[model samples]
Target chain A: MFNSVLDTIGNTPLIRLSKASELTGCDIYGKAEFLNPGQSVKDRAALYIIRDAEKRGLLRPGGVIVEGTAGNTGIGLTMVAKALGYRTAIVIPETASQEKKDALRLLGAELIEVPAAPYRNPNNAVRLSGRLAEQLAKTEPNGAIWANQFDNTVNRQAHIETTAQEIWRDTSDQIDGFVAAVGSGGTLAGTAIGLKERNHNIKIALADPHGAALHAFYTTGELKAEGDSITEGIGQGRITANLEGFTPDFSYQIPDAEALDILFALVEEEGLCLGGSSGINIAGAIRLAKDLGPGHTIVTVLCDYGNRYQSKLFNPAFLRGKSLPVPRWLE
Target chain B: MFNSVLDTIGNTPLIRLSKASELTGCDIYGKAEFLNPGQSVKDRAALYIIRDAEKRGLLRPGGVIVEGTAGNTGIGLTMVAKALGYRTAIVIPETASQEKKDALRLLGAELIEVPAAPYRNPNNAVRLSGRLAEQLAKTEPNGAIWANQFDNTVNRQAHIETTAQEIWRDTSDQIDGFVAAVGSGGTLAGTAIGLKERNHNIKIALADPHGAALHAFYTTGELKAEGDSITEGIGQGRITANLEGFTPDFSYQIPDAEALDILFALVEEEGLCLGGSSGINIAGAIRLAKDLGPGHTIVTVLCDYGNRYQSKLFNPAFLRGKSLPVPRWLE
Candidate 1:
């Protein structure tokens, strides 16, 4: 029996993607990250970052955790903080789903909604969160610390220790390739590194959304991006600190149309109602399976539940407004 | 590794309710039913009913499963149906949360929302579902079947075969009591029967909301209910077919205030974001612990994720509007 929700974070089951496997003639699996207590893989990083801070004396009892996130990390941080006797201040961009913002508030976090801004701008949510944490540290008696999920090495360490190791053990070390879309880059980078250490022959691939420069950087050694995606939380224009020292064997750039198609297929065929990041990740896994030929085993992460994206990814009006093709199932 | 989402329905982790245990001086554990792929204990019932239909040749390939449910069971049926190459027509009471209805649509179920009515009324959601299934069976190329979850013995058998057995194995027969709020009475009745078969000394208690009659029935052998509760899904005026052969040891009538207080405390302290039914279940477990005295072990079910009830249970405005006391965390 588990002692706490935190104890339930890792060891998620790997589910076979029947449709993807059939199409590619390979054994394709998705790590059901939605099973995490916070309903996302970000729970691992959230737990790791806070625990690291506590261990290093950067956080004490009654201390507050502050983070600027798209949605998942903020939710994860808030949940882990609450369980560990800490409060949370979440600075999220207004562009993120309203469902996420509502959830953060309901979860009892201090929610700060700011206008969406690029990383270069000082007013960006991430930068604003840092400022807010600094301000809180001075005012709050127990002090507050910025989790800095993107730059925190502890986030990557979380995946290395728990996620990748679990995958390695569950697959009996017979895995061929691992592919995933990156949010903070921790999941892909850390898992790739850990898997490679266990089996040097294992293939590591990055699943980048169309607007993310990760694919361009991987292919041409230059930071560049094109187009855009309807997907949330799993795209980056520049490599994060977590990704600084890690490089995958290859990369797959998934357009919104391709990702959305796979996303619908997953629900229609596999009964997996997951978000767009999972769509992108599974799309990459399918592509990798094709490249590796038949009979190879591949795994990817289903990052979060589709319910969180009901207003966007699952919203027909939103899809039509964005000029995206409707899913066959929806039609 | 799970070959399909169906394989991931049962074997949920048992989590210690730390605060509840501390308060009662007993070991309290909650079966994390929200961990199911469909995010509720209803998945097991959904899967069981569908598979039973298939086995009995009552449902064939391309069949449509019809169900009238408050929310969770419909969501579960839709998901399970989609996975097994079947369609679903969900008739849900308009009073149910919008979140659940939205989820049903997103999961590709044909949603039919209807007015909430008493079970005696012919126009009730449940009756309408059966009528609709009968009509569809005549017109559709393949037959349609109504999955009457409330009366379906298969629903109870699901818990007996999967849920109760898992709890028994997980707790290692050390449990002193099993408590839960009932929707169709399948969970509590089946689990009670299964647990009793293994260990006759284990206590089985019913957790009933103020609006539900299960408490009165258990205590006085009369179907009677009074007042009302904000809680959904788990209040019945009469015992369901699933509950026919089982009788719990005792019962607890949980007021909305008590349930809401525990709900917030769970999120604030245990970091377990669960629905009102879970709050009631945990509340009952705490009460059972108190009566059973110190050093005893008690178990309860955390029914579903609280996100499904965000519009009501987690909404301070809704709570205040209903004249219910706001949670301390909300304050």
Candidate 2:
């Protein structure tokens, strides 16, 4: 029995990917992060950042939390804030899926939909959120804080304490590799640090989407990337505070086509309906499994549910518009 | 670790409704059914019916499962069928939420969207699904079975074995009352029976939404209903096979106004983003708690996430158009 929704954030199930295991000849598992209360792994970061702020007097009772996110983090922050008697203001790019935007509103978050722009621009969603928080802090009776999810080290601490520990304990410390796509980089960096501390030989692989610069930075010592992906909430060009000191053993750059293929396969074969980031993670996990030879165990994060991306990721018209092939099942 | 998504269906957390408990002077707990793998309590019934069919040889290796449902059951059936290597043809009313339809299609279910009509109509979705299954069974080499969730005894058995047992064990056999709004009648009937058998003093109450007949039947022994409700999936006019031998200790009728009020309050105070059915359940639970007096425990079900109802339930325009008051938080 849980006293509140906050108590149900972690301890998500680790599900076996039967088809992937059979094809790769390795034990493949996915941490079902989509099962989190906010339906994403970001719930951990949201709770931790908010609680950390409370502990240090950065956020007082009746204070407001503000964040600029792709989608999931905003939802996570909003959910945790509401549960803990705080208000939230979410500044999300218009490029985010309509389903996610709808979810944020349904959860009663104040919306600040900004035009999509690069981080270098002053008008970027992240910068706008920070500015909004500063203004709110000065005017409101209760203080406000920017829950800079992308750079907040508390996000990494959350994964280190909960996600990595669960995977290690659930697998009985027999996991051979861990892979995940980075949104704020908290999941991968912190989980990798925690898992390696438990077993130094465990391989930590980064799953980067085609448009993400993390792949290039890890592969070649430069922050460069090309192409693009339809995946939401991931792919960063800069190393965040969460990712500042952590490095993976290797990285796999997954194309949109490959990710979509695995996404469809997961639904058709494994009954798992996951978001695009999960598809990229699974694609990387399968690749890592093959590289590590047969009989090894690999784990990855199923970031969020496909329901959150129905308007784009699962829509046939959207796929055609984007010049992507429709899944065979849909056809 | 779970072997597959199927293994993670039951054992949902019971959440304390702090504000409601304070107001009603009773310990109000809500079973977080929205946390189930398919995001609803229906997952248990879907799995049970399919597995029962397989065990009885009604379903074969390459068989198909057919169902006419109001969204969640179809999703549950589709997911379970996919995991067990079976195809599914879901016949759902066009009036069902678009989110549910999109989810069914994304999960690879063959969709047969039919016009919404009364169950007594010969061309109702339920009858059409039964006919479709018969045709497929005759034509296809592998068989097809209609998973008639509404009347299937297996649906009730599922709740009896899993939901009721879990709630009883979780509360340490000290539960004073249980309440839920009925859709197919399985949840209420089976859970009531299970709780009664465990402790005869445990009060089993029915939470009926407007436009549903169970309230009238339980109060006055008449199968009659009146008015309408924006709530989806619940409010049956007839007692199903699942409800054959069960009777509630009492019943409470929940109007849309009251349900919506509680729904908004749940989001604002408890951070529980639940669907209309859950709103009705919580409203009823609060009433039951008041009637049961202080210190007693009352439990209810949080049917599904509000994400599935964003287009209507959470939309301000829709609420205004329906003459429902906008929530205070939204205003």
Candidate 3:
């Protein structure tokens, strides 16, 4: 209850994206999750994982908190760890941004870089991180917290208490559907589960990274992801245990091309320079809108703002290489 | 009576920053102006200008709007004009960002390239803009209605009714000071005047660019500037009758290096990406807070998000050339 940024985790504004929805004929109010503490929806999960470990007597002050992620989960956990005087060790693929790596180290978190080679997980070097973590934990003293956010309940709790409540409060319980990319599969499960507790009829939709077999896996229990998914944040070759809200009314497998286009569109159209996974969410939202009738409200979470994608998605040069048009072509 | 996106002006979020606050005792909060409808504070000004003109019987539907800015002001006005069905023509200094300029054009606003003259007013090319409006009005049937926002009332009015009110609501009216950078001097003047009407004891501060003469004029009244200022938004080459916040408690003349450093600091420290002028405002706020007493609450506006700077400010090339370390360096 004492002050740390974690206390400031929720209560993001809800705006009816009228311009975005004008053509869709459905009311679309997005939970501005990019407004969260540490500036992403992952902060919710990060806070929960560490805090849940602490409450479960699995973590204590000065404990080594470990997690493997390339995206915001590392950022969120590191922020909390730094605030609470806990030591955090993050293992990430080489593909993570220098910005994220820099921010984590700035927050006093240790970095453990693993190679980005595995076309398949578990084949990658850190794919068997649980074994390495176990070896470290034996010598690392008692109460060494894993801070495993992918399957962590605290991760889901942050979404439920902060994000889902905000969406519900802002909309006055009028939402018809909730859509989000299943980036660890936590945000959708947590928010959707939370909203369902408040109202059972709200639809849950998953926006997936196109080839990440999670869409097939979640909907049918069949593993089928293939190739590289360039977009980070959402979609995985395998689903994590944070799949609390699995039975979504709709699921969207967004291709990298379409996801990239939606990412650029958020910048040019909505002034949101979001990450690739956010694009997946937008693409998923647009598709989800097509299934609903007029005036039905569909809400999606803008998990992180678009500032991180300037060189990747927002820049004309990179976008051009991806065969995106010069500025005029989009117009 | 209907809501267009532009109708979502002002009322920006106030965020209490952690891992920031150069001033130890005073808590620092930022009004995220980039969260506005156009992702820039100018949305408020444009809405006010259009509505103010309407109230005074100056505008008609489908009227041509004119201004001499190419930044957020033009973008804001374009959003309002397009929503209100009015055409807009902006005469820009030709050096504005291609992304921002293209954004205006994409919104159906026409662009006019003005010769790159340094100053506004009196024989300066910027001063002749108002005269050009008069000339255009006679020849074209849907002639230009010059919303000279530099001298307009709406910019600050948007801040007053929306920004100030939101902060007042969020804090329960416990604010102590307001700091802002002047572009056209509207936001500073309007917010100052508006806040003074609510609580006269509150202090107002101005942030001047290093080479802008306003700081010299404010401190010594002899009017001398060092050179051209690079940071946009705040600081003025000369005075405008629009400067209603004339009796500022203090003014800080910030060097471009210092301002840019502050811009990087916000990204590195606060997970907030903002342009240079917003940096000036925050710099001034921090400077003011450093000397102030404890428990005082001060707020500065992050005038726009830094999505437009993806290729420049957020790029590795820019940081590398300057030998600037990313937050990761310390992390």
Candidate 4:
């Protein structure tokens, strides 16, 4: 039996993807991180970072937790902060899903929805979050810590210490490949380093949205941001310390349309109501499995639940508004 | 490791309630059934009933699954049926939360929104669901099975066979008390019967909404339909077969006002995003813990996650409209 919700943050089950395995001719396992207390993989990093900050005396009693998040990490930090008797103020982009905003509100987060802007723009959520943290620090000295997940090495170390070890233990140290979408790069960098330590031959792959530069950067050593994606959690405009030790054997680009199409199929065929990036990861997982031929065990991450994406990904009307086809899976 | 989402239906974690225990001066543990793939305890019953039906001839190839539900069970059945290659037709009352209905739709369910009439009315969702099943049966000839969860013995049996055993295993069979809200009566009745079989002296308690008749029936042996509640998933109008062999030693009525108040507190204090009835059950669990005195262990069920109730329970403007406090935890 676990003690407290924090105890249930990691140790999520690794479930075999039967339909995907059959379709791809490789053994497919999905690390069901969506089962965490906050219903996302980010819970691991959030709790870890908060605890790490506390240990360093950076976050005191009655402290405020501030973070810039598009979706998952905000909810994760909000839940972790609440459990620890801390207040949380998060900066989110206005273009993020309503469901995400509603979730943060429900978790009792003070949300500042900044205008959706590029990374270089001061109005962007990232820059706004940094400013808010600095403002709050001046007002409440020694009582605030910005959990900048993208740059926080603790985010990467959290997965290395928990998720990777659990995956290795559960798979009996026999995993051949790991696939995941790069959100903050913490999951990819941390788990990849750990997996390589367990089995030096284990392959790592990146599932990048077509708009993201990670695929291009990893493929050609050139980082040119050229496109955008509707996918919520994955894809990044710039690299951070979280991606420091991360290198992939291969990377796959998932178009938003294909991601949406396959996402609907996952729900209908596998009975998995997963987040948009989960579909991207599983799509890449299938390609990795095919590339590895038969009998190879490949694992991927289901980042969060589809409930958080209902406003767009799961809504038929919204799909039509985007000029995306109404999937056959929806009646 | 789980083989599929169905494999993740039961064996939910039992987490100690550190905050609740400290506040109540009693040992407390909460079965986090919200961690289930479908994010509810109802997933256990949904999968079990569908499997039982398949074992028999009640549901044949390409059969349609029919049900009348306005809560978690509807989503549970929709997910399960999709995984097993079955069509689902669910009748939902219009008054049910939009979040729940949207979840059902996202899972590819064919939904029939009926008027939100009282249970006894012929046009009520319950009766409408029955009619739809009968019509489908007559036309398709044994092509459909109405998952009458309210009265189904299997509904209760699902908990008896799984939930009770998990509690026993997790707690090492030393629990002193158990508490849960009465929804379809399946969870309460089934779990109670199983716990009794393990240790007849173990206490069982009911958490009822003011509108429900269970508290009156259990306490005074007199039934009166006098009150109403805004609570979505729990409280019932009539006793069903699922209530067979079920009786609680004590009962508590949670007013809607108080339920909403504490629900917000749970998120801010415990980092638990739980369903409406979860608040009811925990409130009763704390009372039961007090009644049992110090040094006694109490266990309760978290029926589902709060995502399903976000529209109403989570929205700040909605709470203000209801004259409920916009929680200070929101900062």
Candidate 5:
């Protein structure tokens, strides 16, 4: 029914995780955003931010889109930019998947790879993204729009208007809980806002990676979780403006092992091939569902496809090298 | 609105090719089947066959799926099999992309790599796939169901029931043309059967690769178009039962260069990240559109996503090394 691929951005299916749900003792469904045109939830934020920018005259005809992302956001931005006849410059950290970089390039986004660093560090991917925008502004007046996705209010607003509304409509307001991982913080906050507006009692749980600061920050008001985590686009070291006043009712800290295990299990048992963040989210959803007891309905996100992370997560050699258990079909 | 991923197989988007339509002087729309859960048009056939097998009791409980494919069909079958609590054995040629093989593996499909050879060769992927199925049948009792997609009548039947119906409904029965490539011949032949039934005069064209015998055979009675071609999952040397009685009104032999060019152009211009066959299909669609002139409505398929072909089709070094120009954004 779509006139274009871009038109298929939102309205993703909210599919029940029968295997995970049964295993977790709850009625759990995944907001399968990995099925998006760019195969990630970032498509919503990118489309929303770009449209908002276009309306506000921030992005004019022939404008260049400059954004810093882990990967999916850039892919999403590039898709929207290409469709609307705009150039894109993406700043990504070197730690991002090689396949993702290739895909971004294939999508025609100019790459600006940066070294992984602390959020405050000047050389950080996020920092470099901002710098690129500033540099572009100085070099080409009114020619570039810095799509600061992290701070962009429209990023979260997009989810509130679309993702949350879809969940509410699809679930018929029967949802009792929402579990998700935060990247730019847009998805969690926006979905929370949307879901809460309809039913304030609905619980929102954040699935934070082992070393992510979000769990510690949410629980104790202190930045405790630390180190470079393997999960991409999720478990941020620092909260962005998009996460302003964002706090989940609970937070689940997911280790890399657990994330990978759940990620593979979902693929094998549930037939859901999703990214690392999705695994973390599922782990958290199951954890939350167990505590919430049976009969309560919970929703989480399958953020992106596993195809992008095949080199690191899905490879048998990589799993073996890491001393991780490869997810095989349980016979 | 679906219970699982299987329910989300059909109802893929039909997006217009703005740039290609403008250049080719006709109204052209691409059936965006890359949006399918397994990211290919093959999902329909896989779902159809498995369900049919279930109804016929051909696939008993705890049965295994045995099939040989370069990538897409295996990926599709694996997804469906896992969902229905069935195991899978995929036989692919060693020449298949590492990413694709890894993907099928990640989907819980046990992979058997065969040496690459011609279709008639005993060691060829297709031939070996059949052999593996027979071997599995001998070893496992009431075990494996060889999803002979190439020869399976249900492969084409799925299109008649789902794909063609969707196209007709989506286009309001205004589709004047159908162009596609024949790998298993499921997509092309199946789609044609469905479309032609609705409107007998609807033109069907085979978008065959340069070295594929499909186009040459369809045009003349010669089993020509020999030699190994780089485009995977779209060209076949032998006529499959899925393509039995297939008679396309015309055929377009697409060169690798032209396919690559169109593939890149669609991504760069229309924000479509599609596979090589999609490129060939697009090239053929554009050519057919040009021949048909303005105001004619032509429909083609984006069979699968380009993610599976990133290592080759979208790779700059790979293209350069192959003496093929990398697809560039032509301003």
Candidate 6:
């Protein structure tokens, strides 16, 4: 079923989150997305953005690819684009990991850093990515194109078309709920549309990071977040348009502390070694898992790769700072 | 098709190595064993060695699981043994990475380290391993079992019954050559058994580390090696009886310099990062690919997770210390 590494994207393996399920006393199945090529789930989104853009004539022959991201999306997009003969440049915030920056460079993406903070500011690196894209689109006439991955329909389409369908097919339609982080909000927004279209009763939950405006928006059409959370993806300082169709699914906000605990548990206990956003998703899912009663199923994406954050999320020192541990429950 | 996370010990995804093929003008595919639940291909061998014993009634229920390995094999075995309710321990050389040791401990395997240089000498670690097992069998009441994986028939048979057959099925009998490192001789033996059983025309190539004796044994019929090579899993300091019935149809001794060069190429060019063992396998396969005309199929493996060797392998500075740049031969 595979040839090029790209064929392996989107068909993530789901395993029952037993250690967490036993602790929470509910059924939780975790989707292993880091299994994708380039070791991140974003590979799904990246692949679609490029293919869909080609379909729309946005990227012609000799097109230069540019995008803004925390890092993974940019890297994933750049990898696919480069293989198809596109030059790539990635705009990233200064706070992103040096490993990711290095990875971007290693994949041959030129980099630009911006001063924007909290990411929701219009001046955020991602929002500002188009500044150079316009320049390249004009200066390199017919030679370049910017990949607007954040609001791009292709991002959500990846979930609607690849991820959700794969889950439904893999589970043989036994899935009861589909939960995921709202990075650019594409995952859940797209997946919810797909899964619910398949089964109207299948509940969709967006596990937002603590202080994210998502749960606030869901519970009470409120707008501002208190501050930025240490968690990476799944939340914005302000709502992104990518959260559009899926905002009502915002189930709860997982605190940074509890998110950190789940991150460590999934690694040591569940043996997943997933990243922070996956942690945020797991924390919220575990909370929901605890209240599911019986005969119920919950599915969540273990988004992104922790390998890029070895110096941080997977570090023992970082765990101490976050107050996460090999919980006594497992002991 | 799935169970708890513990069940994901084998059945890793296969991907044709791309950028390397595009640049080198040859086809090379990698079996991404790094994607195993335990993050290394050794998980397959470990599971097979232990479970085959269980079926044969050699491994008593609740008996301790013991093996001698420093890398992925130990880690994979620990995950299996711990899950099945058996205590496990591994004898390793002091030179093994602390990261691996920490991972093994996290999986609950007690570690016993001995000097790397004096690995033989009967009183040295290798021979002492048997004594360690005898002690466990005597003291652990119902008699613990030593999973003597190196010489076990099932260890190699697992790969033959699964991996090689999958490669054959995927390529649809068009697989002209099978390339792999001779780690503990099992993988090579398995391929030898599988491919020949499938078709007599298949060429088996041993990508031996330069200092290892496998290639030397084929040339001069000598049992000893020239020296130890930096690439782990491929080279052997001591020969096990498992070498029987497994000699390569064609073999290439990949020197450390060329291996490092290929490693850099994989990182910088293809953006597929693997450890030194992968480099050796790729280097040999690259040479073989060129010698064989176009349309001839060659397959290799991305054996271990690169993250485990990030501090050493992923660091370009470390690679530079050895006078290698991301190999220019790579795209």
Q: What is the C-alpha lDDT of each candidate?
A: 0.88, 0.89, 0.69, 0.84, 0.84, 0.71
Name the weakest run of 10 consecutive residues (lDDT summed) in model 4 chain B. Answer: B322-331
Task: List fnat, each candidate.
Answer: 0.78, 0.78, 0.03, 0.80, 0.64, 0.21
Model 6 chain A lowest lDDT segment of ten: A322-331
TM-score of 1: 0.98
Model 3: lDDT of residue B200: 91
- Candidate 1 lDDT, tens digit per residue, B180-215? 988898899888888888898999888899878878
Error at A79, model 6, angstroms: 3.3
- The better-scoring model by TM-score among 2 and 4 is 2
Put down candidate 5 lDDT per residue, B194-225, tens digits, no spaces. Answer: 99989998999888887788877878889787
For each candidate, what TM-score against the reference? 0.98, 0.98, 0.77, 0.96, 0.95, 0.87
Arrange candidates by lDDT, descending.
2, 1, 4, 5, 6, 3
**Interface RMSD after interface superposition, model 3:** 6.5
- TM-score (0 to 1) of chain B for each candidate: 0.98, 0.97, 0.88, 0.94, 0.94, 0.90
List the candidates ranked by DockQ, beginning with the highest: 2, 1, 4, 5, 6, 3
- In the range A132-211, model 3's lDDT, one tens digit per residue, is 56666787664566666666666777777877887887788788888988767778888898899889988888888766
DockQ of 2: 0.81
Give the DockQ (2 decimals) of all models. Answer: 0.78, 0.81, 0.14, 0.72, 0.58, 0.33
Fill in the DockQ of model 3: 0.14
A201, model 6: CA deviation in Å? 1.5
Worst 10 residues of 3 chain B by lDDT: B1-10
Candidate 5 lDDT by residue in tens digits, A58-86: 67667888998888899999999988878
TM-score of chain A, every prediction, order shown: 0.97, 0.98, 0.89, 0.97, 0.95, 0.91
lDDT measured at residue B34 in model 2 versus the true structure, 0 to 100: 86
